[PDB]
Amino acid sequence: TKKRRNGGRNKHNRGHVKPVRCTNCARCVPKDKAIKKFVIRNIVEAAAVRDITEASIWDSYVLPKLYAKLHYCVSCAIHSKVVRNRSREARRIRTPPLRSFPKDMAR
Amino acid sequence: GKKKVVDPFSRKDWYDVKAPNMFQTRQIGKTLVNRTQGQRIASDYLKGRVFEVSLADLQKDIDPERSFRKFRLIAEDVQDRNVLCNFHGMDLTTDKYRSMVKKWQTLIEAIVEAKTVDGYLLRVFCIGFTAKDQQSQRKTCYAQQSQVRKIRARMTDIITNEVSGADLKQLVNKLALDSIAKDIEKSCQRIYPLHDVYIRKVKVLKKPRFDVSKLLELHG
Amino acid sequence: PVVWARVMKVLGRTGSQGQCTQVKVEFLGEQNRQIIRNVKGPVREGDILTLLESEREARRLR
Amino acid sequence: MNPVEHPHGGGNHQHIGKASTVKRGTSAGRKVGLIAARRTGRIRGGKGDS
Amino acid sequence: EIVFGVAHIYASFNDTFVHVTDLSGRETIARVTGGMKVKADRDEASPYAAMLAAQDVAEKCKTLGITALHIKLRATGGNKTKTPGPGAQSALRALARSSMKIGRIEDVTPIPSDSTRRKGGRRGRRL
RNA sequence: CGUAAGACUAACUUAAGCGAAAGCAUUUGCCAAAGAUGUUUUCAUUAAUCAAGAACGAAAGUUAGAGGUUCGAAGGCGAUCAGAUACCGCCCUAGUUCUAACCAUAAACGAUGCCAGCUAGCAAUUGGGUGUAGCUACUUUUAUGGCUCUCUCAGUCGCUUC
């Protein structure tokens, strides 16, 4: 049976939409059927940051951030546990939650 | 028939790079070149050096807040142990360009070409964004895709009035003020309220002539 | 070498039960630069160890 | 043809009998077949030189 | 007193290239990568190999005496991973603790305006 | 630092849009076409759907040229494995590329034919219209632009239960 009203995602008024490549897997999965992670990361862990701001000649030199987007195969995002096996009533929730912590995945 | 013996840095002479009469300070840093010979002249193993340097490191803000604006210099002439390093472009740092792209807004580009009174045929990259006027709880503030082509029209005519503008001694002084970015902003807000405008890239794909008669008032 | 090492916190038995109970080691000359090691051995607060390497940080705290 | 009139001519069955790629300076009337050939066979590949 | 190098940390997976140069990059000093230190083919990725073989360059830039320098992190992404590996900035805490004056840190991996085709083939890396 | 070549158009990219469907993303010019909105415009039933028949039809495959980077069935090696014509790793061939034809199939899916009337909430957005001295950029405020809530068409999404 039809497990989702979305199916993948967002395939309405398109017919067929472009694919991207997975990161860990290097698949060719649709752009919309894709776990996407716009990952912002500090370059220097923010725990070895005091070693680096010692060597900063300038005004302690506020650190640049790393920017990427993690297009994921579905079978290779469950495997890396970005997403997991929700309950059938928890399946329906999309926007909640942010609601966790300060800045995650950095650490 | 060379067979260099040990420590090839021993035959390497240090050369400190310089800067023109453009804005400010002269010496920037040092590079190191081999010793002169009849086959390997040190003066011509050295004019293919492009030197990468920021602007706030050279406008001498002790608190560098313009530190997102690299602009390269091409080593061009060897004189008095210190190479001269004429202009080669105006880039912009990676983590300033990549840090402004958060979705929910409109990226407008203008990749434009014009050349000055002297034939430095340079290519300018006017990059802007759209800004959510507050009191709007909508999350997008996206343009109208003919609103885009109307300001992209407007960004290409003013900067091709600026570039044909009495060659770089005026022109790099404009982007050292970002004086186009304060007039590419107030003009286009009759069309759309625009966000941070970053000129983001300049290639200098053509260079007219070497001819140091035009370099002595530019370096001296 | 015999570089001083005092402790702040003893953790869960990470390392998949080698009872490698990690720690956030404090030093003498400073109080703010000090940072994580993942030691082996049961620790009370006040264990003034001396460690060889002050460069390993072992950044997988749990 | 016949072995008098050609390097390749001659046998009972009709064959070249020896390699058809010949040296550059092999000097007529031997320079027949493939004249100083860098490679032979069908090309399976993209060697347009641009 | 400010002389400047460029560290050029090519913080790949399964190696790390701590290859300082002069400012223009045409002249290289102390080519030391993490591969030339340990040889077991699978600890070349480790942050400890990037620990020792980064300040291994810090002595040999003091043979010529360059106090300050700049950093260039590389990922190694083209049509590839686009983010630095494990031993990425453990080679940065190696340098600043080894009596260096580090101000400039930049991610100079470049990113394409779209890739040609990558390795793997539409269902890539099964197992 | 370069020069050269062929590909691919990232990020912005959406529960956005266009298209009959397959499909469609670098600017700029030119070409022809389309929905929708507006309309005290025009004609006056011209419309509905459809055997036969026509036009288009992802990919792959086929012809004939031009290309030939990346990738890569097939093939050739290295491991793993009792076995391994596989997964994993290397150079690669046909192909991907462009042109001029053929082919006519896809989980071509919303597994849901098209025109028509009715039946409900709630929130978002695409497009157009109309009152907000609601704000608001400044030639001076005005003219515009941006949004604000308030309507309104065609909807499309979303969620809640008849």
Swiss-Prot record, chain A:
PROSITE patterns: RIBOSOMAL_S26E. The keyword Ribonucleoprotein applies. Signal peptide: none annotated. Component of the 40S small ribosomal subunit. This is Small ribosomal subunit protein eS26. The keyword Cytoplasm applies. It comes from Drosophila melanogaster. GO terms for cellular component: cytoplasmic side of rough endoplasmic reticulum membrane; cytosolic ribosome; cytosolic small ribosomal subunit; ribosome.
UniProtKB/Swiss-Prot annotation, chain B:
The keyword Cytoplasm applies. Coiled coil: none annotated. GO terms for cellular component: cytosol; cytosolic ribosome; cytosolic small ribosomal subunit. GO terms for biological process: cytoplasmic translation; oogenesis. Ubiquitously expressed in stage 8 embryos. During oogenesis, expression is located basally in somatic follicular epithelium and in the oocyte at the later stages. Keywords: Cytoplasm, Developmental protein, Differentiation, Oogenesis, Ribonucleoprotein, Ribosomal protein. It is found in: Cytoplasm. GO terms for molecular function: structural constituent of ribosome. Its main location: cytoplasm. Disruption phenotype: Flies exhibit disappearance of the follicular cells of the ovary and abnormalities of the associated germline derivatives, leading to failure of egg production. Essential for oogenesis; required for late follicle cell development. Belongs to the eukaryotic ribosomal protein eS1 family. Component of the small ribosomal subunit. Mature ribosomes consist of a small (40S) and a large (60S) subunit. The 40S subunit contains about 33 different proteins and 1 molecule of RNA (18S). The 60S subunit contains about 49 different proteins and 3 molecules of RNA (28S, 5.8S and 5S). This is Small ribosomal subunit protein eS1. It comes from Drosophila melanogaster. The gene is RpS3A. The chain holds residues 17 to 236 of 268 of the full protein.
Curated annotation (Swiss-Prot), chain C:
One of its GO terms (cellular component) is cytosolic ribosome. Keywords: Ribonucleoprotein, Ribosomal protein. One of its GO terms (molecular function) is structural constituent of ribosome. Transmembrane segments: none annotated. CDD domains: S1_S28E. It holds the Pfam family Ribosomal_S28e. It comes from the Eukaryota. One of its GO terms (biological process) is ribosomal small subunit assembly. HAMAP family: Ribosomal_eS28 (MF_00292). Belongs to the eukaryotic ribosomal protein eS28 family. This is Small ribosomal subunit protein eS28. It comes from Drosophila melanogaster (Fruit fly). The gene is RpS28b.
From Swiss-Prot, chain E:
This is Small ribosomal subunit protein uS11A. GO terms for cellular component: cytosolic ribosome; cytosolic small ribosomal subunit. Keywords: Ribonucleoprotein, Ribosomal protein. The keyword Ribonucleoprotein applies. One of its GO terms (molecular function) is structural constituent of ribosome. Coiled coil: none annotated. The keyword Ribosomal protein applies. The chain holds residues 25 to 151 of 151 of the full protein. Residues 107-127 are annotated as: Disordered. Belongs to the universal ribosomal protein uS11 family. It comes from the Eukaryota. One of its GO terms (biological process) is ribosomal small subunit assembly. Residues 118-127 have a biased composition (Basic residues).
